[PDB]
Amino acid sequence: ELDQLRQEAEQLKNQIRDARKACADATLSQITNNIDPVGRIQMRTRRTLRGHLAKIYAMHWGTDSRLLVSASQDGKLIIWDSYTTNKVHAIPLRSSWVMTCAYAPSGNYVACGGLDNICSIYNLKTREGNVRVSRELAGHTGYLSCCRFLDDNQIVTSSGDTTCALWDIETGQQTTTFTGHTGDVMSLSLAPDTRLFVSGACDASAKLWDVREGMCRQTFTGHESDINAICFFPNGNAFATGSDDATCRLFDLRADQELMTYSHDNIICGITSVSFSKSGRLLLAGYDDFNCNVWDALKADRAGVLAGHDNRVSCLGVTDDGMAVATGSWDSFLKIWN
Amino acid sequence: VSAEDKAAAERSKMIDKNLREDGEKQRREIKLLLLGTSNSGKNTIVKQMKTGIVENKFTFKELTFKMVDVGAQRSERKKWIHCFEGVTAIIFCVELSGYDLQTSRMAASLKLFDSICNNKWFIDTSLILFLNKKDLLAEKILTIPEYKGQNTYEEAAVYIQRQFEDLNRNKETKEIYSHFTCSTDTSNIQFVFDAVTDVIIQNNLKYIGLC
C-alpha cells in the first residue's frame, strides 16, 4: 500500500546524500587558509537615533543609502535621515505587533507586517503631503515574519503558516504560493537578479525557490534549531543562515551543500539577524547577548564586535553603498556604525 | 546649515514632540493578554465587559485596558510570545466543563498553563485565572483517578483551583489571581481592576526601592 513511498523517499534521499558527499572534494577553509586575515574591525558608532519608545523589531535601508525605515512595538514606522539624524516620516500603524518592515527599491513605498496576518503597503511619494495606506494584503494564516520588495507592483512575503507568497500589489491577489516547508518560516532574502529567493524556516531548513514557476528548486538541511535569519551573498550563488543553535552556516546553491560554519564556544545564544558587507567578505550577525558579531565569511574568524546596545539586538542592515551598518535592538535605540 | 535643512530639523523636532505626546498616552494604558482556549471562554469574557489578532480597548475607573487575544494563531508559540514580554498581567480562561466534554480539554488546559506560567518571559508576570462554567459544573456532575473526594458542589471547583495553583513553580515572585466567573454581573472586570492595582503597587514599590 503505502510501503513503497517511504522506502523510495529514503532511497533517493540517501542517493542525494551520496551525490553531495561525492561533490565535497575539499572545504572552503582549506582553500581560504592562505588568505591574509582581515584583522580587527573596530567600527564605532557615528549616529544614535532616538524617538522610538518601545523595542525595535525590524529595519530596512534604502537604495540611496541615506534613508532607513524602522518598525517598533509602539505602533511606529519611522523613516530617518542617517546623515543628519532627522525624522523624515512617522507612520502610525494600525497594529503595533509588527515584526517586519521593508523599503521599496524605487523609494516610493514602504511595507510592514507582523502578528496581524496582513502585509501593509504605505505610499510615501504622494500628494497631500502625508503617508497613506496604499494596500492591505491578506491571505496568510500565520503572522507575517518577513517581506521584501521585487518591484513597485510585486512583493514576496514569508509567514508562519509554512508558506511563502508572491503578491501583485495593484490587484492585491496571491500571484504565487510557495509550499513545502514543515515548520514556520522566519526569514527571507531575494537574489540580486530577482529570479530566485531563499527562505529559512523552523524545520531547520532553507529552501531555494524559483519565482517564475513557483517550484522548490533546492532544499538545504544542516541546522539543529529554528532558522531566524537568512541573507544572500552579493554574488547570488551562496547564502548564509543564522539559527537558535548559536551558529551561522554558509551554503552554496550550485554545490548544493553547506560550505562553512561560524560558531564559538562562549556564545550560547541565538541569532536574530544576519547580513553581509558590500563585497560579502564580512558577515555581520546580531545575537541575543546584547552584541553584534562580525565574522570573516571566508575564514570563520570573529573579526569584530559591535557592543553598544544594552538589550537584545533584533535587526541589522548594511547599505547598498557599503558605507555603514545600522543596528536596531530592544532598547528602543538604533545606531549607525562605521 | 542651509535654510531647507533648518526647516527639516524643525519638522524633526515637531515629530519628536508628537512622538512624546503619543508615548505618554500609550504609557498610561495597561496591556493584558487573553491566553485561554477557544473551548474555554476567551470570547465570552471580552464581550461581557459591555483569522488574525484581535485587540480590544475599554476604560474602567480611569484605567484604560489593552486586552489582546491571540487565539487565531496556528503557529509556534515560542516565536511570538516574546512580543508580550512586558505585559501587565496574563488572563487565562479555563472551562470547568472540560473533563467530560471534548477530548483532552482539561489536559490541554493544564498543559498550556504549565507552558505559560513557567515560561521564561513570564517569570515575574502575574496570572489572572478565570474559571468558567460555574453554573455548568453544578449540573455536569469529579466523576470523569486520584481525586479521593466526594462529588458534590463547592469542592470540585476548589480542587480545580488547587490543581492549577500547584503548577505554579518559583513562587514568592508572582501571584495567581483566581476568580470564578459570574457572567451576569460586572465582578469580572472589577477583579481585573483590583488585581491590576495589586500589580501596580507591586511594581511601584520596586520603582521606589522599597521592594
Partner: single-chain antibody
C-alpha cells in the same frame, strides 16, 4: 489640492488690508507657507514665510515692521495683515505651499493670487527677456551673485514657468530634479553662479515667462525672467 486666495482690492495709501488663503485637498499643517507677490508688469518678489507649527516667521526687507503673516491649522487658513500700505505694494499676491525634508519638492503648488491696488542679498540675473521660438530646442540662462552650491552637495536653484494668464508652476527643483506632472523634455543643468534650462522639442503650453529662484538664504530672490514667444 487647492489654494484659494481672497481679500484683495483697491485701498487708499496709508491703510491696512487683510489677505487670506483657504487651503484644501492636502494636509495643511505639514507645509510651510509663503507669500510671493508680482507687480502688474514686473517679475515675482518674495514677501513672507511661516513655518509648520508657526515656529519660524520671516519677512522681506521692504515689508518688515508693517506686514504680519499668520495661520490657523484647524481652520486651514493662511493670513497676511498689511499696515500703512504704500504705492509700491500694488501687486498680485500668490500663496505658495512648500515642505522641507530629504527629497521634498518645495514651491510645488501655487495658489490663484489676489490683487491689491494701493493708489548683501544674492542677485539672480536673467539677462535675456525675449527669445523667439515649433518643435525646436531652446535654452534659458540664469546667473547668480554668489554660488548656490552648498556644502552638502545640493545646488539650491528652482525653475518656474508662468503661462499667460496662469499662476507659475514648478518645473525644476534643486537645479536638476524634474517635478511631478512635468514632461521629461525639460532639463536643468548648472554649475556655481551659472545655470541653464534646456527644453527639447518645444510644443504648445511652453509659451510663458521662466523664472529662476534661489533658496540658500532669506530673502529669496528671483530673476527678472525670460519670455518665450511664438
Amino acid at each position: 489640492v487647492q489654494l484659494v486666495e481672497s481679500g484683495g482690492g483697491l485701498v487708499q495709501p496709508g491703510g491696512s488690508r487683510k489677505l487670506s488663503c483657504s487651503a484644501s485637498g492636502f494636509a495643511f499643517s505639514s507645509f510651510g507657507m509663503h507669500w510671493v507677490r508680482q507687480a502688474p508688469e514686473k517679475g515675482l518678489e518674495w514677501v513672507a514665510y511661516i513655518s509648520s507649527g508657526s515656529g519660524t516667521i520671516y519677512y522681506a526687507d521692504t515689508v518688515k515692521g508693517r506686514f504680519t503673516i499668520s495661520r490657523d491649522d484647524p481652520k486651514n487658513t493662511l493670513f497676511l495683515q498689511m499696515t500703512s500700505l504704500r504705492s509700491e505694494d500694488t501687486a498680485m499676491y500668490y500663496c505658495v505651499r512648500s515642505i522641507y525634508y530629504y527629497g521634498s519638492s518645495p514651491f510645488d503648488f501655487w495658489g490663484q493670487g489676489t490683487t491689491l491696488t494701493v493708489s548683501s542679498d544674492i542677485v539672480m540675473t536673467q539677462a535675456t527677456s525675449s527669445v523667439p521660438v515649433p518643435g525646436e530646442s531652446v535654452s534659458i540662462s540664469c546667473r547668480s551673485s554668489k554660488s548656490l552650491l552648498h556644502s552638502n552637495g545640493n545646488t539650491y536653484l528652482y525653475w518656474f514657468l508662468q503661462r499667460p494668464g496662469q499662476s507659475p508652476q514648478l518645473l525644476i527643483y534643486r537645479m536638476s530634479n524634474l517635478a511631478s506632472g512635468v514632461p521629461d523634455r525639460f532639463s536643468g543643468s548648472g554649475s556655481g553662479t551659472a545655470f541653464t534650462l534646456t527644453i527639447s522639442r518645444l510644443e504648445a503650453e511652453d509659451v510663458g515667462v521662466y523664472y529662476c529662484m534661489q533658496h540658500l538664504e532669506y530673502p529669496l530672490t528671483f530673476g527678472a525672467g525670460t519670455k518665450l514667444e511664438l
